[PDB]
Design a protein around this nucleic acid. Structure first.
Lengths: 180, 141, 85, 87, 230
RNA sequence: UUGACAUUGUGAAGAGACAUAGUUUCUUUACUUAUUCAAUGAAGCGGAGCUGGAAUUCAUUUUCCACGUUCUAGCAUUCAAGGUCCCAUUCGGGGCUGAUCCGGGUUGAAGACAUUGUCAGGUGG
RNA sequence: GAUGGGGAAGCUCCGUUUCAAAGGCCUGACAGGCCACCAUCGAAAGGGAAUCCGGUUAAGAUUCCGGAACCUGG
């Protein structure tokens, strides 16, 4: 974990996110140290104090540098952006989604993985979504999720064909290699 | 070594009197005394009228053509100490003194490098210091 | 004096009022530190009949301990909790 | 030799402001002024105010910090604080 | 006027920096304030028994004021007055040879708690005063019952320092009055008639009512909206 | 791994036993103060109020919604300018608004079950 | 690896900014106002302010001597 730039986290559920939206901007797109997926240095304007607040989102596919993100609850449905899951209909594919609102993401984070909203419980707000494993699960709407798949799908298809590549792989995350 | 040195001379008060404000001075002392202050004040009057013609020029131009030692204070300025030619004589009973010694000695204080130039300025608050009601008066029912 | 009017009352440790006060003070003492000081007791007669005398030099600390035995579980900790405190 | 943190010597180590001097003395403007005139020391002008006050040509006073070192051990100050306690 | 213009900002939701607002509702207070506000809150919300909250129902302004205006005539002698009394009476017993009763009798309130409760059950009191604000409340809960039993006209004053003001101690938590100069006998006797007017019928309703059934504003608004919808 | 004691609160009904009336057996929900979980430089929680709008009115609003930001790799900070009223002129000091009013529950989840302290079954290198 | 704090019968332990009143200013008439961290230790081979030559001794020199430059802070 020498080179790990930062946890692939979300913004916090502040007043802007909760009663509106905010425009936040990407500055670069960088490869994580020992991760199947890339990340994104992405910056906002802290609305309580005069400075540009950095954030570290996970890099869904399709997103390029020099891009904006309107985001919060009143954000238009577009790739890269984020919403709490109540405003969207069923079928909107998302990723990096939260278990509880403001936990900054547990589910649907790994490379080329996603989740699929299929249902709503709008009264007594929840939202129905399938996992990559496929286990159905219904969660509150106020928690959030980023649009689109994690970039890098098809990392798994390539074989490795020699042991040194696996040693270079598993030097980075954890010494769980060579295995008996 | 530092406590035992005399202060700095910001803009110069003189202890000596002009010897024209002098209970029937010599008339030349009287004349030069009025003359110097006349020069000093007409300079201020000319720059005043410069501001006046400036202001009226700008007021014309708004409408005419088209459109589509610290503390920001020096020593407080000295005021006039003069009796005019009519109100001066013998029969000392006539004598009305003139000039406020408070203003003048305070100018001496600020001038001789003892004190900083200042207002006494009255109160001030930044925020509202909100009022609301006690628990007890709120819930007496 | 009030000595007996307190003593004979604080023996009644299950009345509604004393279990109310117990529910109050236990929460207070939970939120305060483990060891701490109150500048006047909650049981003055019961202090005054141990050797307290309210003058300059006599001090009251209040204190907190877990309940339960010596876990190494079923070893039973011959030190009394009173002594432990 | 542990490069020497520019703004801490000479001008910025003898000239100190009202505000910092009453951060030191903890007491008041008014007792600070009563003390000033009673033990009379007077404000000064330094040769470079910007380099004294760290960039800043803000108009203010400076009091020859050695004089404050003198003012600390002074019997009258105890008496003023006793006036406070009496009140 | 023309040279200056109206800027006005739009703070909006996102398109500005926010200005400085009141946040006293939002701060990290210290632990002792977060204790000692919650304590009042808890004693409000909880269903207190009626052996307590025969406190919490107490004197009015003018009654209390005339009470203290009376008691502030009969104080104890502070030590200054005592030492003057001593340097008088030493000469008085050296020359006049009295029994140390050449000096007159005192007429003063009697302010120790154990003194008070000893005098009660001899019925050597005509009015006693009681302070509501004592967190070691076990000291005080038995007093109105006991005073009722011995038929003495008790009274629950609000404020204990208020009672200390008339003994020259910080706190007394009681005061009593047993013997008075004649010139306030009617004052005292009528004061008793105000006090029992304020208490004798209130005794029926203090005890049949478990105080502190109160909620906070959010729960109150919740149940109000529920009753409104239903 | 299951059951018991206490922690352990307040509620409304039903069935009841007792002196119209308080004392406790259960079935139901319904709640917050205890406790538990999490986060935040403990910043916008809850309520009411304006503005406008659907709303179909069975009179008057029963109501319900919105209540400053979207093509674009920028910038916003010195109690904020402006309006308004005092001051004592002056170099500018102060109030209200601009920026709605009230509570205090920091914000949610959970809540008499959890849990924690202590006991008793099945299994069991 | 301290302190806070919490456990531990206890020697001492978990933890390293977190259930903390942690610290200093800036004008300006004792009152107003802003800021937000958290210790500290650990590299003579990592980062890093700046120097060369000649001569010299029994023995050392980017160290002394002779000459000539540079860095930092005043």
């Amino acid at each position: 974990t020498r080179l790990r730039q930062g946890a692939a986290k979300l913004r916090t559920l502040d007043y802007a996110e909760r009663h509106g939206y905010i425009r936040g901007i990407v500055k670069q797109i960088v490869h994580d140290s020992g991760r199947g997926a890339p990340l994104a240095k992405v910056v906002f304007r802290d609305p309580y104090k005069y400075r540009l607040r950095e954030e570290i989102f996970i890099a869904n596919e399709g997103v390029h540098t020099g891009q904006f993100i309107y985001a919060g609850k009143k954000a238009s449905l577009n790739v890269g952006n984020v919403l709490p899951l109540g405003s969207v209909p069923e079928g909107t594919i998302v990723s990096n989604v939260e278990e509880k609102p403001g936990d900054r993401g547990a589910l649907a984070r790994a490379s080329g993985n996603y989740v699929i909203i299929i249902g709503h419980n709008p009264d007594e707000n929840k939202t129905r979504v399938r996992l990559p494993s496929g286990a159905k699960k219904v969660i509150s709407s106020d928690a959030r999720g980023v649009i689109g798949v994690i970039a890098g799908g098809g990392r798994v298809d390539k074989p490795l064909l020699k042991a040194g590549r696996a040693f270079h792989k598993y030097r980075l995350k954890r010494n769980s290699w060579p295995k008996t | 070594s530092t406590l035992d040195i005399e202060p700095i001379a910001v803009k110069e008060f003189t202890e000596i009197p002009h010897a024209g404000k002098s209970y029937n001075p010599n008339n030349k002392a009287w004349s030069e005394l009025i003359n110097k202050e006349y020069k000093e004040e007409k300079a201020r009057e000319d720059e005043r009228i410069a501001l006046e013609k400036y202001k009226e020029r700008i007021r014309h131009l708004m409408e005419t053509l088209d459109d589509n030692l610290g503390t920001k204070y020096s020593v407080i300025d000295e005021r006039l100490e003069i009796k005019f030619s009519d109100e001066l004589s013998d029969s000392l009973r006539k004598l009305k003194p003139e000039g406020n010694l408070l203003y003048d000695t305070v100018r001496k204080l600020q001038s001789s490098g003892k004190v900083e130039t200042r207002v006494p300025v009255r109160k001030g608050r930044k925020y509202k210091q909100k009022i609301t009601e006690k628990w007890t008066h709120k819930d007496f029912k | 004096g009030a000595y007996k009017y307190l003593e004979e009352l604080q023996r009644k440790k299950q009345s509604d009022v004393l279990r109310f006060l117990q529910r109050v003070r236990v929460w207070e003492y939970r939120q305060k530190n483990v060891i701490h000081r109150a500048a006047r007791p909650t049981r003055p007669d019961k202090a005054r009949r141990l050797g307290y005398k309210a003058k300059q030099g006599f001090v009251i600390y209040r204190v907190r301990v877990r309940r339960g035995n010596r876990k190494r579980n079923e070893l039973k900790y011959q030190r009394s909790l009173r002594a432990t405190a | 030799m542990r490069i020497k943190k520019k703004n801490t010597r000479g001008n910025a180590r003898n000239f100190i402001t009202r505000s910092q001097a009453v951060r030191k003395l903890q007491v008041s403007l008014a007792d600070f002024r009563r003390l000033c005139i009673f033990k009379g020391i007077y404000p000064r002008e330094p040769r470079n105010k910007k380099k004294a006050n760290k960039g800043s040509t803000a108009p203010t006073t400076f009091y020859y910090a050695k004089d404050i070192q003198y003012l600390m051990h002074e019997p009258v100050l105890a008496k003023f604080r006793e006036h406070k306690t009496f009140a | 006027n023309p040279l200056t213009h109206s800027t006005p900002k739009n703070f909006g939701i996102g398109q500005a920096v926010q200005p400085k607002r009141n946040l006293s509702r939002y701060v990290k207070w210290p632990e002792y304030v977060r204790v000692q506000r919650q304590k009042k809150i808890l004693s409000i919300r909880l269903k207190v028994p009626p052996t307590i909250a025969q406190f919490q129902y107490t004197l009015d302004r003018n009654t209390a004021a005339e009470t203290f205006k009376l008691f502030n005539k009969y104080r104890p002698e502070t030590a200054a007055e005592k030492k003057e009394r001593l340097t008088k009476e030493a000469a008085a017993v050296a020359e006049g040879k009295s029994k140390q009763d050449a000096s007159p009798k005192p007429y003063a309130v009697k302010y120790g708690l154990n003194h008070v409760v000893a005098l009660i059950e001899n019925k050597k009191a005509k009015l006693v005063l009681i302070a509501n604000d004592v967190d070691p409340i076990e000291l005080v809960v038995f007093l109105p019952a006991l005073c009722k039993k011995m038929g003495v006209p008790y009274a629950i004053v609000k404020g204990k320092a208020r009672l200390g003001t008339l003994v020259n101690q910080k706190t007394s938590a009681v005061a009593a009055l047993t013997e008075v100069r004649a010139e306030d006998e009617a004052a005292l006797a009528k004061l008793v008639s105000t006090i029992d007017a304020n208490f004798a019928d209130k005794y029926d309703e203090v005890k049949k009512h478990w105080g502190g059934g109160i909620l906070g504003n959010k729960a109150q608004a919740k149940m109000d909206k529920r009753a409104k919808n239903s």
